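quick one, two chains, predict together pls
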Amino acid sequence: QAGSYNLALSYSVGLNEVEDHIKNYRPQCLVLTGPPNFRPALVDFVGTFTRNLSLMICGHVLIGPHKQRMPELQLIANGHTKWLNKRKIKAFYSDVIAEDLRRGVQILMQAAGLGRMKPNILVVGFKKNWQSAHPATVEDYIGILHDAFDFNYGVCVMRMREGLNVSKMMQVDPKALVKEEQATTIFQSEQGKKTIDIYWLFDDGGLTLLIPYLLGRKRRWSKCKIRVFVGGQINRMDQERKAIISLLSKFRLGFHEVHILPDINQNPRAEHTKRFEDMIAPFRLNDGFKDEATVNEMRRDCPWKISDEEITKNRVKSLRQVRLNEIVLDYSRDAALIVITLPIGRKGKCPSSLYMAWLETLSQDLRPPVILIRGNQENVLTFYC
Amino acid sequence: QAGSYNLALSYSVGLNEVEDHIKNYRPQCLVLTGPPNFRPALVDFVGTFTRNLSLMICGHVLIGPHKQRMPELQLIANGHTKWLNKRKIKAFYSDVIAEDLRRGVQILMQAAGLGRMKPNILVVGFKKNWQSAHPATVEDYIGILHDAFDFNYGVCVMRMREGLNVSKMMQVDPKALVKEEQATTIFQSEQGKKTIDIYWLFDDGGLTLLIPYLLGRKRRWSKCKIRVFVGGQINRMDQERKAIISLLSKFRLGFHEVHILPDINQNPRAEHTKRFEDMIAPFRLNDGFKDEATVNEMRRDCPWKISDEEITKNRVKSLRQVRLNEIVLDYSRDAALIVITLPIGRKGKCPSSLYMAWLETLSQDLRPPVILIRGNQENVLTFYC
């Protein structure tokens, strides 16, 4: 019954004609949980949020190198859509055939959606395992974030203790795993109780705040004082805030206490640097970029000599990141989702391994569900005034 | 708080529970036009039908592999969509950046739409000048069709009465302002007195009875004495031809015009084969296939003639297709529009060259409007039962 199909003609192609000056930043969201059943925590998070607010599209990559295996793959599609309908999700299931992940997502990236409805931001299933397989996977991984930076997309990433890409270890009518799942995915069912905190070191990319926001609109998160952990300058705090509270009169917050994070400065802890170093060893010049090695070799020799980009000029950034984790452990010891601003790395000025290590620090172990965001700074305040 | 975006989203997700059952094979189509001001004959064409019926997606692929105009893509689209919208069209433009035609449309076909809302038919604009220069583009153009075949899509070619690309402007132009589109408007603006001529040399194509059905059922297309030319059984007109007549009801055809023209593949004109050959005389070698020549070398070293692949034994299909050309030119003679069934070539037993050769010879003698068509062995009787 393609009724909506037809209805779309009058409504959604009636949505194609709508003015462009509306500029409402529709939070169209794209996700990469691979198979929907797996990495279901991201599905849940992106489902409770945008529950009849914004478009959420599930992109499963089959990394096929040959003729579509079978039309049965379509069956698999209906099975995944039923899995989504066996719970309360509003997901579309789509697939892209490719030979790797970077191009694998890249296909689905600029062709998913249609006209105005097109996805606007992207969340990626974090391959927590990164010190096991070849770094190629890591290079592909930094690929999606960099491409999202080049396509005016929003970058987001989750992380879990047991595993976003939980091994699903096995360690009859099985009922909805939701119960156990929601234990790992409070948003899925559990009404949020503890406070969400936006460690939005970065101001722009409104979603950084919008995400926990339309998350807050949610009844589950209605039980969590939306904590605003701003950080940076210490000399003047409310001076910038008054701009933020103007746009807050627009975006109702209901709070006026932003906790200062002076940890990023004058608060460097040696033992946190030693771990990071011991956490980036086989990752020095492990991008497998022979050309980089060559061009570098004819420029400068050592894997940490030519480092206007190699964890040197941006080293202070690594300090800031580990400090952010330390104030997660102190300032927000416990929280619903630690929303840190997803870092920014310049192509040609920030190497892949450095950035990936930064993310690993920002989402280290022994933390509750954690989410990172960084928007494309198109415009702010468009939604909900 | 009614809203217009959330309603389209709600109808789409309601359709997320749509029934794979009774697959609604609406004429979901994917269209190549490049810039919308150029090749607008396809625009109007696929705009004629599926007006408030299904989804027609326009597709422009930017061929510049360097410096993706992330800043100058939405704006140009806006302008182009406004132009298109000014034409009161019903589509969803799409912008793609890539290095070549082949992978460019490969990106678009397998990722356009969302969930069940997905395009199913591809139409590709012919290149008026293919043999004048740039020989290697034959590979790309034929790979279009082969990958579309392998992708279980619908396939169509586009070549109208006049030249394809509009490159003579410097002496209305914007269809938005004025859209002559005579080649297409003829069917609707002028009251059509001549009819569609189809054929069945490839019975597998189910779409053959749908694309003529769709277009055959439009307000202005009301005037049509449907000439259902089909290779009906030479002895039976009531169980094989009526096999289509029992089904005829759902396609709302109401025509027994099964014009038996068994001269479908009779020995063609001597002259026609001659032209068919020296057409490929310049391309006698597999120039775009040194690699494949080495394969020939190790396999009977066939330099130009290819056993049962070019003309050594494949001529069969060539002389048949040309006979079709004779037919169209004799029976149809002046043909308002022709439903030309795109022939089938499976990779590994026939070259892209011959495929192109076939495409070119479909309507090489003159310049009729190419209303090419072929289906993907999909089920039918979706529209109007």
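Chain B touches chain A through 55 residues (CB under 8 Å).
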